[PDB]
Each structure stands twice: as structure tokens, then as C-alpha cells.
Symmetry: C4
Subunit: 360 residues, 4 copies
């Protein structure tokens, strides 16, 4: 009855989060007894598996503080001067589940590129007290990224470095050999991303998260699942497939703590959201779009809802912690099954004249 | 020519009712010679395979009386004070194919939870003379449900108990060992249900109905197929896959006997219909939506139409009774075949400028 | 390179006409050198493979005359008094590729049921000079149809009888043993049919046409492909899969010779079209809808377009006659390939702001 | 990890460009170091892989000059007098990556049919100095085309002849034996083509491009991929599957250099675009539609964008030239993976209220 993850993904099919479900297990505990403790890198641990994306319409100091206070972490974007990014990290560091360091200050992440401006940008961020840095690229398996990783681990031996983006075990081997402390996974699955239309390169997100995690777990390197998360079930699926944490953009967009002001159109409230490879953000080929997302309220209200939903999902599948979810996934005890297009219709809201969908 | 059910469902695919058809057989009898007699539990038998769902917008005493008079049964909902549910059961018991007990009163079902308030609710329902009780949960394979079943079978040895919801043979083993008299099958396939999108857990309904019934038939325990029934063909498919009875919500919603008033919107008549896990019905995470369904008239006219349609379907496939349909299915005499997206388009109404679809 | 029909259909998939294509061959002749001569029954031959459906919104004497004059045949419907159907057959018989009998009168077909009124209806049609009769049923594998066939072949040994509808080789065995002269194939594929929705019984049309023809060719019994023909490519596919002739409803509906008046709605011209199992046409369960189809002009203009299109299709696949098309299909010389949903999008009109589709 | 092209296309599935992706490789060079040099025929080489289609709404002398100046080539259409086509070729020959001949004049292509008017049309095009000629047919594997090829290679031994259209290795064998210098590939995949609807004959474009190229590479004969190119990723996929050059219609339609005037509808600017087999372009059966495409600016701006996009795609997959892309594809070093319908949705723009899509 059911299929194990190894035989679900080694079929060669192009599986996404919407193409499968997890089969229910046995329940002998309540939902809020479930532990969501998660390893971000080899040496940084969070109370929750949630990470904010380093985009200029998603993460500044206000978003980073709110994610850290709710038990996650925020990565500040680099579409600004080195001075500005360092000042934002300083505001986070100088501000029950809160994510904190050895001095009891909030944890903060930052993003950098792989050019020579980024070697100076790194120094300002290290002086500002950054806890972890992510090399922000579409295709992280490059000589430019490998030279940047080898430079950082020599200059600042204490710093935690996240490599990527990657979608295959061959790409992960080079970055793990180069000494990264974690891997960012996904290519083209993001809500605002058109990289697969424009360059024919990418991967369906569920098989990518599963494949890279199966290779990376052998070296003690955790995986961050990034792009294409639309709901709490997508977070549960990403963690169940081997990811240690989940990074999101559009799902945290249009919250009170996200950068940019609110506006009105068609009688409803909106906030701007755009890809870092859109012409708006940057002979010059575009890799993303710019648009808008509906208002979602404060992260101090929305993150507790995601936490309750992940706990309820772990209870339905029979696991007391995310560590136990991944252990029963790799051992073949957790079970999955595919969905046909008809099953996807049967699984959504159907056969009603009209309906109202409130989540919490 | 064609595939048996055993080789149709052991392929590992995510099959739903819309993904297959039943191949025609040989006809040597008229349609109204077909017998629809069905076992609800180990000791309760109905003239028809139809069951009303225990939802607050579907089953109260008026709905339960009409279903029993038409040869089916109604399960009264528990989103009310225990006094009110016992009084509704009392009104059903105080009221040619009618479903009745040894005292010649109509048969009545009731629903309860698995908390400690439900031990008191159970005693009032037993006082009121209830014939069968269903433990109403999204994931019935739990210590809470198993302790509730073992308590009921000791306190009232005469009472018939229905377990679930379940979608796998591993879940059914625990409830059959605990002593249930029938199993409720389905998770997330309901018209008003978003559990699969919020918690990533569930199963396509046709494979769930087929697999739980194949395990349960060996212990003499019948199966009730619940959620995702849109038409008479779905009822015929559910019974052909091994189910003894079929439970529906939205298909019996907006009938004259269902609870709640009628109202007009967009020039047409409607009645409210909602999931028991919707915020409207019940820090708190929603598992269903609330909406509306178009008016359908009285169950005293609508149920006879479903009965005639199931008889016509049994005639087309060559069987004189539902018992014979399940016997031909398990022996490999009955045949099935898959449908691609193009076959589903060819099977619906197509190639017309406009059309009118009256069923009876 | 490519797949033979035997290995395309013995995969167990639910294939429809839209799910595959025919691979091109070698051309050494012009398009109008192709011969479309087709056997309707064991003793009736037509210049073309086209047959009009016996529906009350499709075939009366005017349609039957035009179909016969253009090289096909028309089957008159039975939703009228036996007197009226016999008078319509009389008007066809009383009237360069024209379909004619030994007396040089036009050929005419008629439809009858399997009840005892039909034994009298048959005699009026036989005296009216009918050339062939079809038993008009949704599921022709019945004791009622077998007794009717055995009665007709004894009463009128000269009469040609078409059995069906069938979709499997097991159904065809009984009717071929009973002595039918041809088989009508298809169940639920028609434009106005909801039999699969309501009774769960039917079959995808391309696999049904292929499987019944493969069994029937061994006894010299031809096959008529009926229901779900939307364009000339569907006619070419039906003939290539083993059918001797193709029957259509909606494709010949709203022509000048079809019964019923024209009317205007939404600024365009329409004619009524309905299923024989719709409540409009006939305690009672509906098996079809009633609607409308856009005007197509005269059959004396429209049938020549279908003839030219089938000749062009035979030229592209490399065959000088329909006999040679079926010979290369059964020998494995003709090749086919499957289509994914994306291939169906690439195969239709795509990537335009607006367009106009003119066929001839 | 991933599938090679040989095992992706030998599955028998109906694959299109949208049904797969290319997995990323290793990067150790910048994007504008990538070489796009491409062989058009056995003796003509271009700086870029881009070709203009010979359609009356796409290629006249203005379009041919602009494509040649940007490093590609244009084929002039033949839906005009032979005198007019020769005069257009004359204007192209009379006019840093520019495509040129031994006399340092721009390269020019022309189209001809397989009738006896075309033997005279050929002589005027040779008079005018044409560099290459394409035999313009829907099904090029015919006695008419083979006699035309054998006539041209004897009359003008210096002329380069392109055969087709073909979609199978059996069709290519006859034209390669006849002595063609290149093959045009595709049937029914074009934006304005309904050949698969009307004649049931054609092939999904990605499998056709891959299979004809695998057979043709053994004889040193290059392949031109024609029809169904919607974006830069489609060009990258076509070249990666073995094509030497890519031909497009709709993607170059509504540019400043394309023939026909601009017009306004619904507040936007448009230009007419139609299939050569539409009734507008030419008892007669249509094989294409006529419509409109939105304005796209000058080819001197649009072609550089396509060049930058193909270079970026080659960089993401790890290749310094198109020659190396095809070498990694045939050796099994390049990797691909399939996409389910859900993966195609995840890969496009999703989960936004509104968005703006600018490419450059
Ligand atoms: N799937 C994804 O994750 C994805 C896809 C597209 C864009 N994006 C987002 O958009 C942003 C842009 O991504 P990107 O990949 O263009 O960033 P990038 O700076 O790596 O890309 C610039 C290009 O210049 C080249 N380059 C990079 N570093 C270099 C160096 N040191 N020397 C010489 N050449 C060098 C690379 O080949 C690269 O294609 C990213 O921050 C990312 O978050 C993400
Ligand atoms: N697929 C489905 O069938 C489905 C899915 C969702 C909701 N529903 C409907 O919505 C209603 C709500 O379903 P539900 O599963 O939330 O009901 P429930 O009362 O079982 O759920 C409440 C939660 O509290 C916990 N719990 C239950 N009994 C307990 C006890 N005795 N002690 C301690 N903890 C206990 C359980 O872990 C459960 O998740 C149901 O009546 C059902 O009809 C159905
Ligand atoms: N897929 C299809 O081809 C399809 C499906 C539905 C309807 N239809 C059309 O609608 C019309 C109605 O079809 P139908 O199958 O209902 O016709 P029918 O007269 O065969 O059906 C009437 C019912 O009465 C019973 N019956 C038939 N003859 C009998 C006899 N001699 N004695 C006792 N009982 C008998 C049969 O079991 C049948 O279900 C047909 O003419 C057909 O063209 C076609
Ligand atoms: N998939 C495709 O590539 C496709 C499909 C349809 C149309 N088209 C376009 O439309 C145009 C029309 O295509 P077409 O195939 O009809 O051109 P065509 O001139 O080859 O077709 C005319 C028909 O006449 C016949 N014929 C051709 N040459 C002959 C000769 N010398 N003697 C006797 N008979 C002869 C052929 O059988 C052919 O079907 C083409 O230029 C093409 O670009 C393309
Ligand atoms: O412009 C872009 N194109 C493609 N991907 C991008 C772009 N900008 C950001 N991304 C990715 O998109 C993710 C956010 O996707 P989302 O959570 O689905 O909304 C980011 O974390 C990046 O991995
Ligand atoms: O809130 C909810 N979420 C999910 N499933 C529910 C909920 N409430 C009821 N159900 C299920 O939905 C079924 C009715 O589904 P329907 O017949 O498709 O309309 C019920 O019998 C329950 O099994
Ligand atoms: O009411 C009905 N329900 C289902 N099938 C029918 C009905 N009436 C006619 N048919 C079938 O529909 C065919 C016509 O289908 P069409 O060519 O697709 O429009 C007829 O020849 C019959 O086989
Ligand atoms: O009328 C027609 N029907 C079918 N295919 C055609 C027709 N006219 C041109 N073609 C093909 O369509 C291609 C252009 O397709 P596009 O690039 O997708 O817009 C041409 O290069 C021809 O191969």
C-alpha cells in the first residue's frame, strides 16, 4: 500500500508538489506536542523551518526582525549600496521561540553576488555582525562562485556560507567540496520567474529538493527548499522530502513587515512583488516579472498559522518532530501516492455555486 | 479486452472516479428487476446503498426520516448540544422500501467525536434509541478513537459502531482489531474540503475505496464510500469497486428536507452548504470552506431517480444485484478501462453552440 | 520510427482520436486518384465511407436522398409512427457517385427497436422497399436484440441487418453468431451523449473502433464507427483504425437537408440538435442533452469537401484506396505516434492575437 | 541523475518542446564568449542559427537583408510571379556578423514548388544570383519532389537545395539519396497550421527534430527546425536536440521589416500573418488560418535579444558553442528531464494578482 519516496522519484517522471500526496499514519499524541526545530546550516539552528527570501520586495531589517522573533530567519537583499545592506544588518543585530546568537542578539542573514564588488560588500557585512551569508545566483555551479566560497572560508573562518542555487547532485558535489555550510535548491519554480521559458534550463521543484537532499545528507550539509511554495501543504511536502528549511517569497509578500508601501486597485489592497532578474529590479535579457500580491497582515499573526498547520500535518502523518519525518521518509515507513489531473480537481474545492475560503 | 480492478489499481497511478469506465456486459433481464439491497454494518441492512452525511447543512431529523422512508439512512450531526442531537434521534424513532428495526420504527444514525464530552453524548443517544453511531474524524487511526471504540463495545454491546475516516489497509487493521462494525472511507475528496491542500495528506477516492474494501471484506466488515460523489455514475463506480454503501453531502444539499432556509442570488435559488472543519462551522486552522448549492427539490423525488439510474447501470454491466456486481469485480469477470484527458472531453457534452441538461 | 496500431492500442491506455497522429508515407500519385469505395454490409457497397445517423434532428427522406446522391447512405429515425417511417422510406425509393440498388433506385436505411411494436414496424419498412435495417440500442448485447435478429433473418432472408451498439469483442461475438451483416460501434462518445456521466458505462472511441474491427474482420463483417467525429481528421483516423464506414450526427446537423427549421440567437443562424435519450426526444432517466448547432449549408456542398479531405489524407499517408489504408494498418507498414497535452496545443491554432478559420 | 536525449525520445511518448527541460551543467566562462556559428547547408555557414520562413506575410527583400545583416538568412516566398521573386532576390544581392558570399554580397534564399512552372521560376532565380533554394511542400517525400531535386543538381551543380518538409527518418532517406544539401523538418506544428486537425497527419515537433537529425548527421546533412517556436527556450531546445538552424514565422511576424502594413484594433498595433495553405493565401481544402500578430519593433533590435538569450542558455548548460552543445547531447553528457502539467504551471508565472512581462 503506497510508494516510498525513493521509488516515487527514481521513476524519471517530472514531479512537482501538486503531483503527489502523503498517506496518513498512526496518531498517539496531540498536534502542539510536535517539535519543528530545524538546522539552517552546519552550526545555526532555528525553532522553526521558515526562511525569508533575499528579494528587494521581501526582506529588509523589519522583515528580518519579525522572522527571527517568530523562530525563523531573514536574509537581507543586495539590490542596494554595500553601506545600506550593512546598516540593515546592524538594525537587526541591535534590536519564546526567537532565533538568537551566543550574545543573545537576533540572528541575521545577508546576500552577496560573485563579482569583485562583493569582496568589499562581504567585509562591511562581517563588521556589521552578520551570522550567515548566501551567494545569490541562478546557477551556483560556477568557477566564480567556487572562488568566492574558497575566499570567504579563508578570510572569515567563523562565517557560515550557503551555496546555490542548484537542482542536481553533480552541482552540489562541487559546492560541498568547496566547503559550503548549506545548499539553496530550486531553479525556475518561483512565482515571479520565467527562466525556464527564456533559457530552457531548470527542474520541477519536488524532485530537485529530494535529489539534492539525498546527496547532501551524507556530508552533514542541510538543504533549503526555495521557490514555488503556495500553501502550508507545500511546506509540509518540502520538509518531508528531505529539506531542513523552506524559503519563500510570494507567500510572505504583501505582509505588514515587507518593504514598499500599500496601494489599491479593483477595490482591493496590494503591495508590489518582483523577481530580482526582472528589468525593473536590474543586450539585457529578463529572467523574471514584476507584479503585485494581496495584503496578508502581520507576520506576527501569519507565521503562527503556518506553524500550527505544519504541526497538524506532522500529526496526520504520525511524526512527533521534523527529524522523525525525515527519518521515516528515508527508512521507507512514510508513504506517498501520485495524483492524476482528475485527482487534483477532486482534491480542490469543487461542485459549489460559490464559496468563501478563510484559512485562520 | 479490458482490465480487471486488481490490475487497474495495483499500477500505482493516482486514479479517481473520472479516470476510468466500466466495460458493458450481457443483458438478459429488465432494469427494475435489479436488487439494490445493501449491508450498512455487520447487523444492519438497507433496501438501497444510499447514506446521508452527518453535516450541519445536510442531516437533521427531517433528512433522516426522508432517507429512511426512501430505503436509505441518515446520520445526525453533532455541531449542537448533546440534548438537541438526542431529541432529533427521538423524533426520527417517534415518526415500501422503508428502513426499519425489530420494533418497526425507522432506522437512525448519529455522530460523535473522540473527546470526553462524547462519553456523555453517547449515553443520551443510547437513551434516545439510536441504531448505529459513527466516530466523526478526519484521521480515525488514533489512540483517541481506539479507546472510544473499546469503551462503546463494553458499555453498550448491542450498539453498531462505524470507524474512520481511513484511506489505507494499515489504518483499517487497527479499527477492525478494535471491533468496529463498518468503516467510513475517504480523506480530502469532499466537495467542500481543502485538507489535501492545507496538510498534504489524503488519497484519490477510487483507489482508497477499492483498497480498504479489499482488506475489509476478509473480516466481514462493510465499507461506506464518503466524499467526492457528483453524479449517479460515481455511485455506480463506488459500489462496483467494493463499497457496500455510498455517503454523500453536496449531492443531497439544497434539497427540501436539508436544514437551513432557501435564498435568491443572481436570479436563482440556493441553500448554504459548508464543511465541518470550516471556520464558520467551528490558533485554529481551517480544513474546509463554506458556500452554497443550487436547489434540487424533495428527496422523495430525487432518491427514486438515483435508484433508477443505479439499476440502469447494473443492467448495462450485466448484473442482477449489487452483490453480483462485487462478485463479478473480485472474480475478474467485470472489466474496466482508463480515460486520458481527451477521452474525458469526448465523454462529456461537446461540439454544441448551447444545450439543456435535464436529468429526470 | 513510429508505432504500429496493434502496439499502440494493446498498451491498455484510454486512447481517443485526439491522442495520436498518423506518420506520413511516400507519395507517387495525385489526390483525386484515391478511391473511397466502401462496404456498408456483407452485400451493400457505397462509393464513399459516409453514413447519416438515425436521429430525429438529422435523418428524414430529404437527408437520405442527398446522402445517397453524394455516394453515402441515410438511416431514417423511428421517433414517429411506423406509418410515417415507411412513407419516408417510400419517398427515398420513389426519387455520378450515387448509391443505388439492382432496380437503379437510391439505397435507403431505417432504424427499429427491440420491442414487439418493432415486429410490425419492420413489416411496413420491408413492404416500403427498405434496403438495410439497424437495431437502434445503447447496449446491443442483449437477449432482446438477439431474438430480434434471429426473427428478421428468418422472416426476410434478403434483408441486411446491422447490430449494436457494441464497444468490445465479447459483445460482437454474440451478434456475429446471431447472423448480423454489419456492426455499429461506439458508446457515450457522441456530442449530445451523457451515458458515461450517468451510468459509468462506455469506452474511448478510437480503441473501441480498433478492437471491434480486429475481431469482426475475421468473419467478413464490416464496422460502422459512430459518435464523436468533429472533423475530417477524425474520419481519416476512424477508417485507418479498421472501420469500413463512418456515421455522424453533429457534423451533418444544421445542414439545409436536415429536419427542423432554422432560427437566430446571439446574431447567428442555428438548427436544433438532440440525443434520442434526452427527455425532449422520449421514473425516466436521461442519457443525452438537447441543444443547437450552427448552420453549415447544403450537403451537396459539404460532402464533396469531406471527400476531398479524406483523399488528401490518404495521399499524405501513401495509399491509393481505403482498402489499401486498412491493409497497411494490419500489416504494420502504417505508423502512428501518441500526443501529450502540450503536443495537442502545438497541433491546434496557437500564438495569434485573433484568427479566422475557413475550411473550404 | 537526469535522462540522455536518446532515452528521453525512444520511450514512444508524444514529446513537444514544453514537455521537458535541460538540466544545468558547470560554468567557467562568461555568456558573450559563446559561439553561435551554424551550418545552413553542406557549403553555406552562418554566424547565427536563425532563419526567416518563406511566407508572404514574413519574407520579402527587406526582411532578407535585415536577417542577413544580423548574421542569419531569409528565404523569399513564391506566392507571386516568378519575375517578382527574382527581382526581390536581386535587391538583396544588390544591397560585423553579416552573412555573405565569395563576392562579399549578402546571402539570399528562395522558395519553389514541384510543378512545371517551377522549372522556369528556378532559371530566373539562378539568373538573379540566388545562393540556396528550398522546395516548399507539406510532405516532401514524393516522386514530384525527387524529380525536381535530380533536375536541379544536374542543371545547376553549384546550387544548394533544401528538401522537406519531413518528420521521419524514412522520408529523409529518399531526399538524402536524391542529393539534398539540407532538410527542413516539421509538419503541423506551425502557429497558423491546422494540417493535423484536417488530415490526421503530422508529428510532435521535438521528437521529429531529434529523430531526423540523428539519421541525417551520419551523411553530413544539416537540419532546419521549422514551426512551433514561441520563445528563446524553444530555440535553445531545438538546437540542443540536433538542429543546425531554427526557422520561424510568427516569432518574426509584426516586425518593422516584415511585408504588409500595420493597423489598430482594441487599442493595440497589429500586422497580418497567415498560413500559405489558408484560402486567403491560395474543390480546395484549407490547411492553415489567417490572422494577426502584435507589433514587435525592428529585427535589428529583436535578433540581438535572441542571440543574447541563446548565449545565456548555452552558458547555463555549460557549453562554449552550439557544436559543443550537440557533441554533449550525442555523447550522453547533456541531461534532460520530463515535465508534468503541474510542473508546466509551476514553471510559468503563477500566484500573482497582476504582472508585467518585458523581455528586453
Ligand atoms: N532559479 C533561480 O534561483 C533564479 C533564476 C534567475 C534569477 N534569480 C535571481 O535573480 C538574480 C540574478 O541572478 P544571476 O544568476 O543573473 O546572478 P549573476 O550575477 O550570477 O549573473 C550574472 C551573469 O554574469 C556572470 N558572472 C557572475 N559572476 C561573475 C564573475 N565574478 N566574473 C565574471 N562573470 C560573472 C554569470 O555567468 C551570470 O550569468 C539572483 O540574485 C537570483 O536571486 C534566481
Ligand atoms: N477527510 C475527511 O473526512 C475530513 C477532513 C477534515 C475534516 N472533516 C470533518 O471535519 C470535522 C473535524 O474533523 P477533525 O479530524 O478535526 O475532528 P477531531 O476532533 O478528531 O480533531 C481535533 C484534533 O484534536 C485531537 N484529538 C481528537 N480527539 C482527542 C482526544 N480525545 N484527546 C486529545 N486530543 C484529541 C486530534 O489529534 C485532532 O487532530 C469532522 O467531524 C469531519 O467530518 C473530515
Ligand atoms: N452510446 C449509444 O450509442 C447510445 C447511448 C444512449 C442512447 N442512445 C440512443 O438513444 C436511444 C435509446 O437507447 P436505449 O438503449 O434506451 O434503447 P432501448 O429501447 O434498448 O432501451 C430501453 C430499455 O428497455 C429494455 N428493453 C429493450 N428492449 C426490450 C424488450 N424487447 N423487452 C423487454 N425489455 C427491453 C432495455 O434493457 C433498455 O435498457 C437509442 O435509439 C440510441 O440511438 C445511444
Ligand atoms: N507542415 C507543413 O510544413 C505545411 C503543411 C501545410 C502547408 N504548408 C505550407 O503551405 C504550402 C502548400 O503546401 P502543399 O504541400 O499543398 O504544396 P504542394 O504544391 O506540394 O501541394 C499541392 C498538391 O498537389 C500535388 N502535387 C505537387 N506537385 C505536383 C506535381 N509536380 N505534379 C502533380 N501533382 C503534384 C501534391 O500531391 C500536393 O498535395 C507550402 O508552401 C507550405 O509552406 C506547410
Ligand atoms: O527574477 C527572477 N527569476 C527567477 N527566479 C527568481 C527571480 N528572483 C528571485 N527568484 C527566485 O524566486 C524565489 C521566490 O519564489 P516564490 O517563493 O515562489 O515567490 C527566490 O527565493 C529565488 O529563488
Ligand atoms: O471541513 C471539511 N473538510 C474536509 N472534509 C470534510 C469537511 N467536512 C466534511 N468533510 C467530508 O466531506 C464529505 C461530504 O463531501 P461531498 O459529498 O463531496 O459533498 C463528508 O461526508 C466528510 O467526509
Ligand atoms: O441520447 C443519446 N445519448 C447518447 N448517445 C446517443 C444519444 N442519441 C444518439 N446517440 C449517439 O450519438 C451519435 C451521434 O453523435 P455525434 O456524431 O458525435 O454527434 C448517434 O449516432 C448515436 O450513436
Ligand atoms: O497554411 C499552412 N498550414 C500549415 N503549416 C504551414 C502553413 N503555412 C506555413 N506553414 C508552416 O508554418 C511555419 C511557420 O510556423 P511558426 O513559426 O510557428 O509561426 C512555416 O515555416 C511552415 O513550415
Amino acid at each position: 500500500d503506497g510508494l516510498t519516496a525513493q521509488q516515487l522519484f527514481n521513476c524519471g517522471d517530472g514531479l512537482t508538489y501538486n503531483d503527489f500526496l502523503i498517506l496518513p499514519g498512526y496518531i498517539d499524541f496531540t498536534a502542539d506536542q510536535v517539535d519543528l526545530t530545524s538546522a539552517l546550516t552546519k552550526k545555526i539552528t532555528l525553532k522553526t523551518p521558515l526562511v525569508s527570501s533575499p528579494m528587494d520586495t521581501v526582506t529588509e531589517a523589519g522583515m528580518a526582525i519579525a522572522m527571527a522573533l517568530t523562530g525563523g530567519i531573514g536574509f537581507i537583499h543586495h539590490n542596494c549600496t554595500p553601506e545600506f545592506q550593512a546598516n540593515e544588518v546592524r538594525k537587526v543585530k541591535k534590536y519564546p521561540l526567537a532565533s538568537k546568537d551566543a550574545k543573545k542578539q537576533l540572528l541575521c542573514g545577508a546576500a552577496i553576488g560573485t563579482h569583485e564588488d562583493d569582496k568589499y560588500r562581504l567585509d562591511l557585512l562581517a563588521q556589521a555582525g552578520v551570522d550567515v551569508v548566501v551567494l545569490d545566483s541562478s546557477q551556483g555551479n560556477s568557477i566564480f562562485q567556487i572562488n568566492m566560497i574558497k575566499y570567504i572560508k579563508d578570510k572569515y573562518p567563523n562565517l557560515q556560507v550557503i551555496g546555490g542555487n542548484v537542482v542536481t547532485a553533480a552541482q552540489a558535489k562541487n559546492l560541498i567540496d568547496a566547503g559550503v555550510d548549506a545548499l539553496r535548491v530550486g531553479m525556475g519554480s518561483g512565482s515571479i520567474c520565467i527562466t525556464q521559458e527564456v533559457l530552457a534550463c531548470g527542474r520541477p521543484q519536488a524532485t530537485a529538493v529530494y535529489k539534492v537532499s539525498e546527496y547532501a545528507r551524507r556530508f552533514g550539509v542541510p538543504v533549503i527548499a526555495d521557490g514555488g511554495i503556495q500553501n502550508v501543504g507545500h511546506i509540509a511536502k518540502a520538509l518531508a522530502l528531505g529539506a531542513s528549511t523552506v524559503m519563500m517569497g510570494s507567500l510572505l509578500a504583501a505582509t505588514t513587515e515587507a518593504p514598499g508601501e500599500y496601494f489599491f486597485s479593483d477595490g482591493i489592497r496590494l503591495k508590489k512583488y518582483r523577481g530580482m532578474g526582472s528589468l525593473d529590479a536590474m543586450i539585457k535579457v529578463a529572467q523574471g516579472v514584476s507584479g503585485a500580491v494581496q495584503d496578508k497582515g502581520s507576520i506576527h499573526k501569519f507565521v503562527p498559522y503556518l506553524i500550527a498547520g505544519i504541526q497538524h500535518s506532522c500529526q496526520d502523518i504520525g511524526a512527533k518532530s521534523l527529524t522523525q519525518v525525515r527519518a521515516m521518509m528515508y527508512s521507507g515507513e512514510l508513504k506517498f501516492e501520485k495524483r492524476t489531473s482528475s485527482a487534483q480537481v477532486e482534491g480542490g474545492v469543487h461542485s459549489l455555486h460559490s464559496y468563501e475560503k478563510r484559512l485562520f
